[PDB]
Design a protein around this ligand. Sequence first.
Ligand SMILES: [Cl-]
Ligand SMILES: [Cl-]
Length: 162
Amino acid sequence: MNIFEMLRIDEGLRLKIYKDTEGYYTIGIGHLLTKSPSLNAAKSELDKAIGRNTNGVITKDEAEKLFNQDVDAAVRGILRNAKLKPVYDSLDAVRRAALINMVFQMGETGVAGFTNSLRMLQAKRWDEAAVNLAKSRWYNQTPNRAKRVITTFRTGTWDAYK
Ligand SMILES: [Cl-]
Ligand SMILES: [Cl-]
């Protein structure tokens, strides 16, 4: 198991524009297109991202390409974030994947706000962090995915994905 496989499981794969759990237009493997309520706006962001007139549909290769870019960007965003970096640097490989997952889903700023959880993770107080992570809108809105990521931080194994 790895970050790619992990996110592919959490996000799924869709080749036509769709609405995410928050109602935002998305495509591929969780690639958010726009928050605007307009489908045309989403189509235009899609064409711009792909480099062609897609008409709201992309191929598998194209989805994978967006996915590679998104993963790379999340990593680099963590590495650039003063609040995230030190956490990421302190963790083992499996738990780093859990942090990347959360940034991919919620954005760097979003994650940077779990101040308290971040502090516990850095301190390696696993059970405590798991408990604090659960007291969040994130956990209440997407509980199954959240539970998977949380178990990963708690245990440091990929069991929730097996
Ligand atoms: Cl893009
Ligand atoms: Cl869920």
